[PDB]
């Protein structure tokens, strides 16, 4: 069970959390639940009505039932409140509290499937919602949607209406594939819009009309106007952009990717401090697109990225250093500032590879060193890096203006 | 009659003024002169006394007579006042008002030569005097001097006493050679002390006892106790140290060498402004020892000499420049100061052969040029003297930190 982000040889490798039913176990918020106050429900010569009493445990159908274990034997099932009018839309809302890549959303009913329902998603933690899938026989009437609309390479963030659900009365499932039907699911791994389509922080499914005049017209309701669902599932992985092997509870229970590849953020959607030599790209299966640290030769704490710099190279590197501290300067603090010179004995990384100009006042003709070698501008007859000694064939005078005069012969 | 200081080829040549009788024509100052009031003088069986009357022109003997033309015929002669006691010293003082190199001092008497006289000189324009020559029979008694003292190579600034004058009564000369007798007159041209010995700004000759008991003891005087001199001469040249062809009247009649060889002063005893590359030596017959101008490549008005500098070379040059003005510096203002660089197009002498560092702010890694070539410290990929253009194989970025990034291939 090795590190999935760490390739063999300690290298980077794209990594994504286990695929899960994110709904499982989690508490779902339903607009209507039978049992409060207790009331009998007929179950349709099929009329065998039983009691839904919320208090009475063995005869209750709470929303908890929606998500717990479902085995055909001793199966368990939530049930909406009864005698629904027509205008109704009964809603189940699920809040993951983290961005997810959802592959499917599936419900299994104990009641007959709705004639109209609609799946929604929140990308924004519950403030606004988006059409995900529509199900109805009368598409244009109920949801104002073309029936079985086509999905071009454009307009493939389209939430379609379909009669697929209409096929049953004793129960049965209706499941929604997010990727199915889209043209660009060939290579989702590098699809910018399908990677956005399959993202949700909350999920909401809203039944809006039941499967019913022959007896008595179309108006008032009866014991059998209710919905029941046994198992809700949203299948998908935690949204980590491939830079994390799992999600996990942060400080203060805000579930978040355990980020890797020198990425940070809740979705690993960015690079980690001082790791800005390369732009944050989402990890594909080909290149793990980790965040490589800029290089400052140990003379800068902070760092910055320039995209031109990246583009101007072979898309190799674009990092930049800030306030080079040890009398260094340059993009990478690579060279020694004016007024100093590269101490060649120390290595550039060393705190003190930049040494100062204690050049000779009389000897040298200037104050500033060569910024590599240290050589000061020697007066005509003086030699040395400091210009602190007369060339051979010259004699030291007491004069500051000119020491080291020519001996002739 | 060409320039004697200017050798053929316009070169330097030692030059000295015409040799002269400096006393000639000049007014002499005598302590005693007969004629005021008129009195008869006996001239010694020789007693043929005539009249000295200062007013009476044809019978006067003023000091003017001492120096004017002297031809044996119609000769002319000054005469001291008469009836001199013994203590007397009668003095003739001559003031040249300029330093001279005197070869001889000669007097010709109409009276009998003194038994004691003494020649003196002033080197200091009349304040103090120095023994030059002594003449007496009683040397130790009169002048307190050894008779015919010898003249070593040392102690050859000695003023000797001699009986040379004693050999006559009707007249006759007594002349004094300054150089005669000295050992170092072989090469006076390069003798430091004989060149000093023969120097005088004033000359004074003092008769102190006459050439007389057989008749009447030794006490009171008679008509014939007087001195008379016909021609006084001091022979010599104007003291120019060989750097001037003649002396001549300055502003305000202060006679002075017309100095040459880039020398100045009254005696040409020094070098002329900004001509201090070589110490002032007196011109010998071998080397004219002119004053060579120091070199400042036209960037300094003033200049100075260092003797160490001269000694440190092959006694070649020792000049130094002051406040190099055109952003130059150095002994000769030879190089360009820091913050500038030698404009190689102009010649060093040009006002503007020092050009400034308008180096590139982004391109170059420093503010200061090479002080010869101008090259600034180029950042890694930039080329140019200003570092104002990217090297080939590099692409200009908008970044100040690093423009001119590597194109790879
Ligand atoms: C069911 O849904 C829509 C609205 O969706 C939600 O309904 C509730 C379950 C609750 O979640 C609300 O916050 C949502 O608005 C119903 O009709 C719409 O709701 C607005 C309420 O602001 C109402 O004014 C309009 O009739 C509708 N607005 C828009 C923009 O369409 C409706 O009852 C059901 N929908 C269908 C298609 O039957
Ligand atoms: C003649 O000379 C000396 C002094 O020389 C000068 O005498 C005058 C002509 C006048 O020029 C003075 O200014 C000079 O001093 C006579 O004796 C000396 O003179 C000083 C006077 O200050 C006197 O006190 C001393 O006797 C002498 N001083 C010294 C230092 O010797 C003297 O009359 C004559 N000399 C001889 C040798 O006979
Ligand atoms: C430091 O010295 C270097 C090396 O001399 C300077 O750059 C060189 O100048 C020579 C001059 O002959 C050229 O031949 C080289 O091509 C240059 N090499 C480079 C620019 O890498 C440089 O200008 C000096 N810099 C400082 C700050 O003194
Ligand atoms: C100006 O540049 C010169 C020439 O590069 C510097 O002196 C030379 O440095 C090189 C380095 O490779 C040596 O090989 C030469 O021997 C040096 N020549 C000299 C000293 O004459 C000099 O230090 C620089 N001066 C300034 C003011 O920038
Ligand atoms: C119909 C029904 O379940 N009635 C129950 C009663 O049997 C029980 O004793 C009581 C306890 O609070 O709650 C109510
Ligand atoms: C002896 C003598 O020379 N005396 C002269 C006199 O002859 C002359 O007339 C006068 C003029 O001032 O001066 C006096
Ligand atoms: C529902 O069950 C609770 C708990 O036993 C009880 O209080 C209530 O009476 C029941 N209601 C009916 C209608 O049986
Ligand atoms: C000297 O000459 C002047 C001018 O002739 C005269 O005044 C004076 O009397 C003369 N003295 C004697 C003593 O002859
Ligand atoms: Sm590998
Ligand atoms: Sm696993
Ligand atoms: Sm269940
Ligand atoms: Sm009926
Ligand atoms: Sm010649
Ligand atoms: Sm001549
Ligand atoms: Sm005469
Ligand atoms: Sm007698």
Swiss-Prot record, chains A, B:
Main subcellular localisation: secreted
Localization: Secreted; Cytoplasm
Domain of life: Eukaryota
GO biological process terms on file: anterior/posterior axon guidance; apoptotic process; axon guidance; axonogenesis; Cdc42 protein signal transduction; cell population proliferation; cell-cell adhesion; chemorepulsion of axon
Keyword terms: Apoptosis, Cytoplasm, Disulfide bond, Glycoprotein, Laminin EGF-like domain, Repeat, Secreted, Signal
Domain Laminin N-terminal: 11-237
Free-text tissue specificity from the UniProt record: In the embryo, widely expressed in the developing nervous system and in mesodermal tissues.
Record carries keyword DNA-binding: no
Residues annotated as domain Laminin EGF-like: 238-293, 294-356, 357-406
Disulfide bonds: 77-110, 238-247, 240-257, 259-268, 271-291, 294-303, 296-321, 324-333, 336-354, 357-369, 359-376, 378-387, 390-404
Residues with attached carbohydrate: 53, 74, 89, 370
GO-annotated cellular components: actin cytoskeleton; basement membrane; cell periphery; collagen-containing extracellular matrix; cytoplasm; cytosol; extracellular region; glutamatergic synapse
Function: Netrins control guidance of CNS commissural axons and peripheral motor axons. Its association with either DCC or some UNC5 receptors will lead to axon attraction or repulsion, respectively. Binding to UNC5C might cause dissociation of UNC5C from polymerized TUBB3 in microtubules and thereby lead to increased microtubule dynamics and axon repulsion. Involved in dorsal root ganglion axon projection towards the spinal cord. It also serves as a survival factor via its association with its receptors which prevent the initiation of apoptosis.
The protein's assembly and partners: Binds to its receptors; DCC, UNC5A, UNC5B, UNC5C and probably UNC5D. Binds to its receptor; DSCAM. Interacts with APP.
This protein's name: Netrin-1
Residues of the whole record sequence present: 37 to 456 of 604
């Amino acid at each position: 069970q090795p590190d999935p982000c760490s390739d063999e040889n300690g290298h980077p490798r794209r990594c994504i959390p286990d695929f899960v039913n994110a709904a499982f176990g989690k508490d779902v918020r339903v607009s209507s639940t039978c049992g409060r106050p207790p009331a009998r429900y007929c179950v349709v010569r099929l009329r065998s009505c039983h009691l839904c009493n919320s208090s009475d445990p063995k005869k209750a159908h709470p929303p908890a039932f929606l998500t717990d274990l479902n085995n055909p034997h001793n199966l368990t099932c939530w049930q909406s409140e009864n005698y629904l009018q027509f205008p109704h839309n009964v809603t189940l809302t699920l809040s993951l509290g983290k961005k997810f890549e959802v592959t499917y959303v599936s419900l299994q009913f104990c009641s007959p499937r709705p004639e109209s329902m609609a799946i929604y998603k929140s990308m924004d933690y519950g403030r606004t919602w988006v059409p995900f899938q529509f199900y109805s026989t009368q598409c244009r009437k109920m949801y104002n949607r073309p029936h079985r609309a086509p999905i071009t390479k454009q307009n493939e963030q389209e939430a379609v209406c379909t009669d697929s659900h209409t096929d049953p009365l004793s129960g049965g499932l209706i499941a929604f594939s997010t990727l199915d039907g889209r043209p660009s699911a060939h290579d989702f791994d590098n699809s910018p819009v399908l990677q956005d389509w399959v993202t949700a922080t909350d999920i909401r499914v809203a039944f809006s009309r039941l499967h019913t005049e022959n007896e008595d017209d179309s108006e008032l309701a009866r014991d059998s106007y209710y919905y029941a669902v046994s198992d809700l599932q949203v299948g998908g992985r935690c949204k980590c952009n491939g830079h994390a092997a799992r999600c996990v509870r942060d400080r203060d229970d805000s579930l978040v990717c355990d980020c890797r590849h020198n990425t940070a953020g809740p979705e690993c959607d960015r690079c980690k401090p001082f790791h800005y030599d390369r732009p944050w790209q989402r990890a594909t299966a080909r290149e793990a697109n980790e965040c490589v640290a800029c290089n400052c030769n140990l003379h800068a704490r902070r760092c910055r990225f320039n995209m031109e710099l990246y583009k101007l190279s072979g898309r190799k590197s674009g990092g930049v250093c800030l306030n080079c501290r040890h009398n260094t300067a340059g993009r990478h603090c690579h060279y020694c500032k004016e007024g100093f010179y590269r101490d060649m004995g120390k290595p550039i990384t060393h705190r003190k590879a930049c040494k100062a100009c204690d050049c000779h006042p009389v000897g040298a003709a200037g104050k500033t060193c060569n910024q590599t070698t240290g050589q000061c501008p020697c007066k005509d007859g003086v030699t040395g890096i400091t210009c602190n000694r007369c060339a051979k064939g010259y004699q030291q005078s007491r004069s500051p203006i000119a020491p080291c005069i020519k001996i002739p012969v």
